């Protein structure tokens, strides 16, 4: 009834080449709605097209987003992370070391130091098991506007939040459309669901 695909188990390991790395991920996740395993998105370059992720609705293991220069990770359809397996034994979502510091300037496509600015998870409502680990993302905004209490399942015994808020740039406020000022990005289509 849903499009199924496997995940990966590479963790923080450095890929053979950026050419094979993105091509493999595109081949794996394009069309996929249910990842039966771990969604790992690592070492992705600044201008990497990630539109193949648009259909992903659930991840059965953990989500790892690490060492990316890509400015935005679009997982706007991701509704649920199960935490059937965990990162560092405790975490269902881990966002780590994503890029380089940048000031308040809106990025210039070929000049501006790369790094994750926003984790676009508008549909995320459920984390069944495991916590959230967000560390060392200089350009990342909006982790601290999110109410993770509403996302953690009531049975989640490992509902941990280890969230670093340190930033190189100031965050633009959520759009007024996001009631309660909780959002994943600066757009009105980025509010917490």
């Amino acid at each position, epitope marked *: 009834s849903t499009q199924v695909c496997t995940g990966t188990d590479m963790k923080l390991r450095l890929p053979a080449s950026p050419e094979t790395h993105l091509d493999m991920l595109r081949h794996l996740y394009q069309g996929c709605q249910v990842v039966q395993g771990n969604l790992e998105l690592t070492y992705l370059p600044t201008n990497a097209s990630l539109s193949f992720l648009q259909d992903i609705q659930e991840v059965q293991g953990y989500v790892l987003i690490a060492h990316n220069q890509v400015r935005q990770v679009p997982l706007q359809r991701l509704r649920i992370v199960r935490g059937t397996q965990l990162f560092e034994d405790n975490y269902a979502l881990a966002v780590l070391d994503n890029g380089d510091p940048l000031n308040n300037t809106t990025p210039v496509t070929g000049a501006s130091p790369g790094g994750l600015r926003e984790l676009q998870l508008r549909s995320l409502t459920e984390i069944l098991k495991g916590g959230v680990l967000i560390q060392r993302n200089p350009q990342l905004c909006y982790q601290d506007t999110i109410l993770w209490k509403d996302i953690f399942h009531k049975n989640n015994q490992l509902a941990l939040t280890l969230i670093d808020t340190n930033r*190189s740039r100031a965050c633009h406020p959520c759009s007024p459309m996001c009631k309660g000022s909780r959002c994943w990005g600066e757009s009105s289509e980025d509010c917490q669901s």
Partner: single-chain antibody
Framework: PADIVLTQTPSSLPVSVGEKVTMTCKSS????????????LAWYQQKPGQSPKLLIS???TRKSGVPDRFTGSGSGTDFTLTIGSVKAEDLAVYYC?????????FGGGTRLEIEVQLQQSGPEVVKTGASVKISCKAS????????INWVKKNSGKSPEWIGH????????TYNQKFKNKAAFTVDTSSSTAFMQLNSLTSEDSAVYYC?????????????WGQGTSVTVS
């Protein structure tokens, strides 16, 4: 990415107590951000002998405690500050300020005439060619959650944004004019920010401020330090 110029009118406004007053701030670029429909414009008040204080950020949002007789209005490039009924205490210079693009800039000012703490180091009297290191001690808030902006203020001139530093990531942005003049450092442990000024000439003689700014709704500069006078002989 051109520098934004803020034009303030009138540059001086004679008033009597009880009068309604309107001052204009016009921008060379729109300050409206289309993603959040917010205008990145603030107003500041500097009374004689005192450091500037935030009145309004966001074109029309007053800082907590500011009298409702002060009203900010306008959008895009056109902005006004109105005082419904002027008090004797309102006699000061009012500066509009943009935080939309680098460098952050101030208007020429309108002269009106008839917990969180930032402790700066004492006055500096130095010679030509010498250096100076101004300290800024922060208290009453989480130091790494905020930026430290540095501002130059001369008698009878509008404030100049020297630049700012991210406390947590030690990321410094400078006004082009101060690139080979000022250098920022921070110490997370002692909640102190530093600015070193080198190759000091007479043009570098002024009052210097450290100013806090934050994130989200607190994006604008809010709390100013008491100031540090540097005189170069």
């Amino acid at each position: 990415p051109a520098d934004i110029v803020l034009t303030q009118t009138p540059s001086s406004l004679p008033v009597s107590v009880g009068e309604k007053v309107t001052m204009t701030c016009k921008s060379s670029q729109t300050l409206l951000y289309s993603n959040n429909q917010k205008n990145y414009l603030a107003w500041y008040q500097q009374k004689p002998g005192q450091s500037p204080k935030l009145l309004i950020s966001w074109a029309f949002t007053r800082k907590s405690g500011v009298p409702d007789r002060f009203t900010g209005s306008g959008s895009g490039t056109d902005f006004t500050l109105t005082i419904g009924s002027v008090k004797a205490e309102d006699l000061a210079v009012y500066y509009c300020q943009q935080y939309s693009n680098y460098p952050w800039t101030f208007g020429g000012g309108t002269r009106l005439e008839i917990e969180v703490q930032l402790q700066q180091s004492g006055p500096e009297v130095v010679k030509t060619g010498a250096s100076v290191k101004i300290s800024c001690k922060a208290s009453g808030y989480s130091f790494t959650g905020y930026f430290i902006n540095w501002v130059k203020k001369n008698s009878g001139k509008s404030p100049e944004w020297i630049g700012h530093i991210s406390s947590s990531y030690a990321t410094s942005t400078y006004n082009q004019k101060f690139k080979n003049k000022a250098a920022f450092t921070v110490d997370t442990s002692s909640s102190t920010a530093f600015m070193q000024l080198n190759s000091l000439t007479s043009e570098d003689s002024a009052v210097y401020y450290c100013v806090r700014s934050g994130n989200y709704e607190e994006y604008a500069m809010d709390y100013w330090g008491q100031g540090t006078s540097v005189t170069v002989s």
